[PDB]
């Protein structure tokens, strides 16, 4: 890897610079390099890794949706034939997206997850695993579509089981996991009732635990609770 010769601390320093410059591809490459040093990541470092790839793949997903919509329109009756170009370019963006997902999943499998013993780290990585299988599922149309969806579900479910045993209901990782697993149910598993039940139950159990928190923890937890509420409002 092209980051093999750079110090771990220098990679982290540059990831932070890249974030400030909104250079997310660079940020992601720096963090991949840092992970490949083979040491466990701190909480701050895990956040850098997740922010980087979230922004890169988020952009690819947005572009893929623009292109898929144009392609869909092209296959409506009355649309004049414009050749293979729309499909080709949607495929190009799709393949790059799958590449990024495969890269993240590879980092998690080699060897972030297996070295993650504390609940906070393990849940965080398993959530990411769910997220990146979810992104693969969004674009999947073939023989493996069901297995991709199940891979997402399985990762989310393990994360959920740990989070419920080991973390308080207001823990931002537990919250963010529930938020995303709820979206998985609504958007990927065709289970809107499960999505709604999960978001509601998570919101309500968090509400009842807010009294235990400092002002700063309250701010963190309520921000994510509002996202649960936003989704519920969208869905009901």
């Amino acid at each position: 890897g092209a980051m093999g010769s750079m110090e771990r601390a220098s990679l982290i320093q540059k990831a932070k610079l890249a974030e400030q410059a909104e250079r997310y591809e660079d940020m992601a490459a720096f963090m991949k390099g840092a992970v490949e040093k083979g040491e466990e990541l701190s909480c701050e470092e895990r956040n850098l890794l997740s922010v980087a790839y979230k922004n890169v793949v988020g952009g690819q997903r947005a572009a893929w949706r623009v292109l898929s919509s144009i392609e869909q329109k092209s296959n409506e009756e009355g649309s004049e034939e414009k050749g293979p170009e729309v499909r080709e370019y949607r495929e190009k963006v799709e393949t790059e997206l799958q590449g990024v997902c495969d890269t993240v999943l590879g980092l998690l499998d080699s060897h972030l997850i297996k070295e993650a013993g504390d609940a906070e780290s393990r849940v965080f990585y398993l959530k990411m695993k769910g997220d990146y299988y979810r992104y693969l599922a969004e674009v999947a149309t073939g023989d493996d579509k069901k297995r991709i969806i199940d891979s997402a579900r399985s990762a989310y479910q393990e994360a959920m089981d740990i989070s419920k045993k080991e973390m308080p209901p207001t823990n931002p990782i537990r919250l963010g996991l529930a938020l995303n697993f709820s979206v998985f149910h609504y958007e990927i598993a065709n289970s809107p009732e499960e999505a709604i039940s999960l978001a509601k139950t998570t919101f309500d159990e968090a509400m009842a635990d807010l009294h235990t928190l400092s002002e700063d923890s309250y701010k963190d937890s309520t921000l994510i609770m509002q996202l649960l509420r936003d989704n519920l409002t969208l869905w009901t």
Binding site: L179, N180, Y186, E187, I224, L227, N231, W235
Partner: peptide
């Protein structure tokens, strides 16, 4: 589309 983090 819905919120995720």
């Amino acid at each position: 589309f819905p919120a995720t983090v």
